[PDB]
């Protein structure tokens, strides 16, 4: 990867796409930003870049951090000293090769569609999607596919595994004006690095490809180590023989070598879960009883702002609180008094089949490091007004058993939630982008007033066609009552 | 412009002779026929005429009796007048489907259903709220009546 | 000064694409470049196969979109979304054979009730003149729809032609003013970007690449 | 003019012609008011799968495309990508019959999804000639696809008018076939009040016990249907081909929109109503008259009359101002104050169809 | 022509023929005006369980999701001809549910069981016992000839008319019946406001009781029904059309005379129909929009209703140039310009129908 010259980018202000080696990226003043046809793969790319940059160059001092950001982290020699690692080949070595296993060749052969996350996951895919994205793939367009598949996608089920954060895990990366600055901004300083995975003594710092997964039922776990975990790719697949000089099906560009398939097989193992990933937040839950640790994943069709609090607010048990991702935690310490520009993305899954994909860039102004409680507030507000509408319409539909009121009954909350969410997406992220955290709770008040009006209007709108029958005009009295019983607990301030 | 509460007072103080004439009427257009009515309403009043429907309805409702409709000022604490739905609900005499039928009623039928409800109820209410709803008497007002009734009857339980 | 062609998009429903490989097919609050390009493409008669005329059209024209909030009986009608639940009997388990599922389901987001006023001008490297587009937009040779065939027009595309320096100054000549604006130019004294993947990657079908709109607000 | 616009106002007795995943009536918000809706997809399926469609477009004279009759043009247009013998190998493969001189054209006109489709076959048999798999071996692999195109070579009008079936097994950009008729969503001209049928399922063995409770949403409406036909595209995708034939095809669509209804819940409810008004209009540009109903139509003596009136009034002021100069004709079951002398009034649907058949003359 | 259209105008004295969850009259909004309504589903049942149905069509289907009761019933009626275990296996194959005891077994949803087919299936399972072909093989064999199974459906005609649908067992593969009768909800031709009967229960021993309400209303109802003859032939096993029309006439008669029995003890709305029209056509048509403009009273609602119906029919027939076999039966002939045949009595109308639009 380092010598390889695989990275696709475009210059910030104007561009024709160019293909690059990690060297010229790390050693240049030019402002480059990533460029691909798909965003999830851009995220995968940048995650790869941050992973490797973190592995090769993680160290103090904070001054060095800032300096590396503003002034390029290498004269060619400075960087050339930095790459002892020769694990990035997929030339291929028979011994290592390629961020996946070699040997274990179990025909028949499978096309490269499966590795591109979105396509051919399901039936409607064959119906609604363009064909022939999987014909031919390249050094970059493929490596990115592989990493993305290992970490951010849940394929392919059926005795395969997804690790380590889980399936559909979400990423959180700090963004800078240029790819260079960005890749570094998410690197972990040697001590911040040391705090999380220090134990070391039971280290393995050897990738699945350098040293293999220990066959079956292991257990050991928690001794994954600094390196072997981040480049943990359990797919256990031998990438097929490269071919040709022609366009990447999706890289969009001419390439000297291309890949038109891969070979797969079933591999099973199991690990005790407490492995600390710098890239994603995780949520701590207590019942009864023993604590429950797992990583944030998109579960529903809901707007992204609903997640914000989880992404940039740390918590401690037992309130039960979440834990933010390490990279964010680092960034807040290193540069307070600087606004965040977070990028977060992930999938929604059932089995092989991808249902929704979200990739986001979220904006915060200054205070979020200090009193991100305010941030938690606006989320809980926005949700508090939602659940009011939902409960009111649920009562409108199912009805009150006592005292003997008959319910509608049609499912109106379901379709109103979408309207609410749609019109909310306009107002909540937008404020949260521009609030003077220091003295800004009047802003929240105007927000509550607008959400209040929205809930009133949507409630009245959703019920309007059915309220011509005294049968139901009676139920909406009580339903409207519950609506305002819910709305009153929120607003006054 | 708009119609005062002075109409209510005027109704209260007018002699029994005239009031017996007005009280003796099945439907509002029949109220239009008799003279004491024109004499009552001339001030407020005929012939704007945008007001006339409202005045027919109002007087027709008032016609129920001398003290069928009792006027109670909004309390300082509540800051909202007790309204017709709440009143009919409060009286306890009224059965809800007779109000459902009120919602279902059309033109002359609606007032007649209503006049019948008050006499049996002997309600207390803020007169201009009744005036306001009677002035328009749109579907919204009809619906609000029932909502008010059901809600207060449920609260009172 | 600058020559403009001014168009209007006026369906009871509209759909303008956003990134998807799944069955759920979203929309945004305003048209997309790929959409508008496809729209003139249709009006001009450009078939899907010939990259030449597509590429020509894409290089040739640039757009500016003004959002027209609706007023009737002097009450504002804000825009709104739909989610159409959309099934298919059949079809197409594979791209190749005659084999099908009984039922595939898809969800499709639509836009109500939205009107847009849109200005387009010639790039320097233009391969055509504004008058061809005029002629093509007044008499299309393929059916113009926005942006699914489900959704027709209620006002003709052609609204008018103008001379002006800035697209703003050009849009102001046409009636519903005060709408938010999204342009590729420029504009002085206005800062904010808005990011979208609506730039049709014409060389490679059927995928798109990132672009940014300059955002303007009248008040 | 290239475009034919069909506007239908149809009223329906209580029913539930189209449903969402949660068994609720499909709706749309127009003019700021909820409208009950019937999706284009449902209308089009109702049309496409109708008997009348099968009779008049399934059994159309232009349904069969003969490949032997297109040797000259196919060689001409594909001479640049392939060599003639490869082309011949493909056509000989598809038709299974070689090279007999056919006195007919040679139309000098070829629908683009056919040249598009056969080109792909030329690409396959070419490199198959390269490999080289001898014809018997490769025939085994392309066995599905040949059948797939052969069935498509018999549905010209159907594919041309309504677009590919898919699954049609077509594999190229040119083989994405659209049009020629565009069908709009049908929305009510008025805001609707929805009636919930609160039904039950009685057990004969447990007849005197509490029952099985169910809810179904229905509503009656006056729906505005809009449809559009691009004649040039129809000829292009179909022929050939003469306008008169295209118009003959258009009349069928006109009939179907006036008479055809989606079959959803037509057993249990029975909204088998015929269209109360139909207008056909020729134009350079397609236009829908939905904004006639942007202001929701309020009942005076039902929704139908004021809907017709609203439509008529809108057409009068708006139509000239827009691109709709000529030529349009209307079929009504009745109203006074017809819209204007400008449009010809037609007593029957058949006369309207005839009017369309003769290019609105 | 394939489609037979049945139009009925029937007037009713104050009644409550069909009820809401709140014991309120079923209604529908048409032309922006409220109408009293009678569900199709209720009419169909009133037909199935009618005396006339038993007299002229036979055995009404047995709809229940109680399989345990059906075990016993089927054993009682088919015990003499079969073995209980075979019956059991047959039911288990048909419902997908296992049949043993298991005091309560139950089905996914209420399904129309005719006993004849179950007997037939038991015979098939006896022939299955010989081989014995594994149940799937037997199913593969029985999927080939559906019509044979449908011939058995001449008992249980109601299913042939209104259709059944299976999710579970082998009834999903063999039991799917569609068509053949389409029936509308019956709606008033005019706007209704519903009368509230305020009743009391008198305590003899201490005769001040209190108040219960029943909502009633009298209306003129328009009933529409439709039969797809071809589909009925298919559903009955290929039966002759000549046979199908007889069933159709029975449906016409029932549609003209039968009334739901809900609250008929206390409100006796046993009225026949003042008009019945039948017409043959290529495509189904309903005359409901004749009444979209709610009919205003001149001398009752019935008279203007008949008039409205006829005028709308003229407009549609001329506009759509429907050349069709059509015949009308009225009690009050009082008159259509239309070239539709007038029948003095119902029996003549029925005969007209039996003889395929006879003239
Ligand atoms: Zn690539």
Curated annotation (Swiss-Prot), chain A:
GO MF: DNA binding; RNA binding; zinc ion binding
Consequence the record notes for mutating residue 129 to A: 45% increase in phage sensitivity; 60-fold decrease in affinity for target dsDNA
InterPro entries referenced in this protein's UniProt entry, alphabetically: CRISPR-assoc_prot_Cse1
Record-level GO cellular component terms: protein-containing complex
Domain of life, source organism: Bacteria
Induction notes from the record: Repressed by H-NS, activated by LeuO. Activated by the BaeSR two-component regulatory system, possibly due to envelope stress. Part of the casABCDE-ygbT-ygbF operon.
Keyword Cell inner membrane included in the entry's annotation: no
Disrupted-gene phenotype: Loss of resistance to bacteriophage lambda infection, loss of plasmid silencing.
Assembly notes: Part of the Cascade ribonucleoprotein complex, with stoichiometry CasA(1),CasB(2),CasC(6),CasD(1),CasE(1)-crRNA(1). Interacts directly with the 5' end of crRNA, CasB, CasD and CasE. Binding of target ssRNA or dsDNA causes a conformational change in the Cascade complex; CasA is required for high affinity target DNA binding. Interacts with Cas3 once Cascade has recognized target DNA.
Protein name: CRISPR system Cascade subunit CasA
Natural source organism: Escherichia coli (strain K12)
Lineage: Bacteria, Pseudomonadati, Pseudomonadota, Gammaproteobacteria, Enterobacterales
Gene from which the chain derives: casA
Swiss-Prot record, chain B:
Listed GO biological process terms: CRISPR-cas system; defense response to virus
Induction: Repressed by H-NS, activated by LeuO. Activated by the BaeSR two-component regulatory system, possibly due to envelope stress. Part of the casABCDE-ygbT-ygbF operon.
Gene3D superfamilies attached to this UniProt entry: CRISPR-associated protein Cse2
Disruption phenotype: Loss of resistance to bacteriophage lambda infection, loss of plasmid silencing. Increased levels of 57 nucleotide crRNA and also 2 and 3 spacer-repeat units.
Keyword Transcription appears in the UniProt entry: no
Keyword set, alphabetical order: Antiviral defense, RNA-binding
UniProt cross-references to CDD domains, sorted A to Z: Cse2_I-E
InterPro entries according to UniProt: CRISPR-assoc_prot_Cse2, Cse2_sf
Pfam families: CRISPR_Cse2 (PF09485)
One GO term describing the cellular component: protein-containing complex
GO molecular function, one term: DNA binding
Superkingdom of this protein's organism: Bacteria
UniProt key word RNA-binding: yes
Family, similarity comment: Belongs to the CRISPR-associated CasB/Cse2 family.
Assembly behavior: Homodimer. Part of the Cascade ribonucleoprotein complex, with stoichiometry CasA(1),CasB(2), CasC(6),CasD(1),CasE(1)-crRNA(1). The CasB homodimer forms a cleft that cradles the 3' end of the crRNA. Interacts directly with crRNA, CasA, CasC and CasE. Stable subcomplexes of CasBCDE-crRNA and CasCDE-crRNA also form, both of which are able to bind target dsDNA. Binding of target ssRNA or dsDNA causes a conformational change in the Cascade complex.
Protein name as annotated: CRISPR system Cascade subunit CasB
UniProtKB/Swiss-Prot annotation, chain C:
GO molecular function per UniProt: DNA/RNA hybrid binding; RNA binding
Induction info: Repressed by H-NS, activated by LeuO. Activated by the BaeSR two-component regulatory system, possibly due to envelope stress. Part of the casABCDE-ygbT-ygbF operon.
UniProt keywords, alphabetically: Antiviral defense
One GO term (biological process): CRISPR-cas system
Description of the deletion phenotype: Loss of resistance to bacteriophage lambda infection, loss of plasmid silencing. Decreased levels of crRNA.
One Pfam family linked to the record: Cas_Cas5d
Regions annotated as coiled coil: none
Domain of life the protein comes from: Bacteria
GO annotations of cellular component type: protein-containing complex
Subunit structure: Part of the Cascade ribonucleoprotein complex, with stoichiometry CasA(1),CasB(2),CasC(6),CasD(1),CasE(1)-crRNA(1). Interacts directly with CasA and CasC. Stable subcomplexes of CasBCDE-crRNA and CasCDE-crRNA also form, both of which are able to bind target dsDNA, and at least CasCDE is able to form R-loops. CasCDE and CasCE complexes have endonuclease activity. Binding of target ssRNA or dsDNA causes a conformational change in the Cascade complex.
Family: Belongs to the CRISPR-associated protein Cas5 family. Subtype I-E/Ecoli subfamily.
Name of the protein this chain belongs to: CRISPR system Cascade subunit CasD
Organism listed in the record: Escherichia coli (strain K12)
Swiss-Prot record, chain D:
GO biological process, one term: defense response to virus
GO molecular function: DNA/RNA hybrid binding; RNA binding
Gene induction: Repressed by H-NS, activated by LeuO. Activated by the BaeSR two-component regulatory system, possibly due to envelope stress. Part of the casABCDE-ygbT-ygbF operon.
Superkingdom, taxonomy of origin: Bacteria
UniProt cross-references to CDD domains, sorted A to Z: Cas7_I-E (cd09646)
Pfam families, alphabetized: Cas_CT1975 (PF09344)
GO cellular component labels: protein-containing complex
Disruption outcome: Loss of resistance to bacteriophage lambda infection, loss of plasmid silencing. Increased levels of 57 nucleotide crRNA and also 2 and 3 spacer-repeat units.
Keywords: Antiviral defense, RNA-binding
Described function: CRISPR (clustered regularly interspaced short palindromic repeat), is an adaptive immune system that provides protection against mobile genetic elements (viruses, transposable elements and conjugative plasmids). CRISPR clusters contain sequences complementary to antecedent mobile elements and target invading nucleic acids. CRISPR clusters are transcribed and processed into CRISPR RNA (crRNA).
Xref: NCBIfam families: casC_Cse4
Protein name as annotated: CRISPR system Cascade subunit CasC
Name of the gene: casC
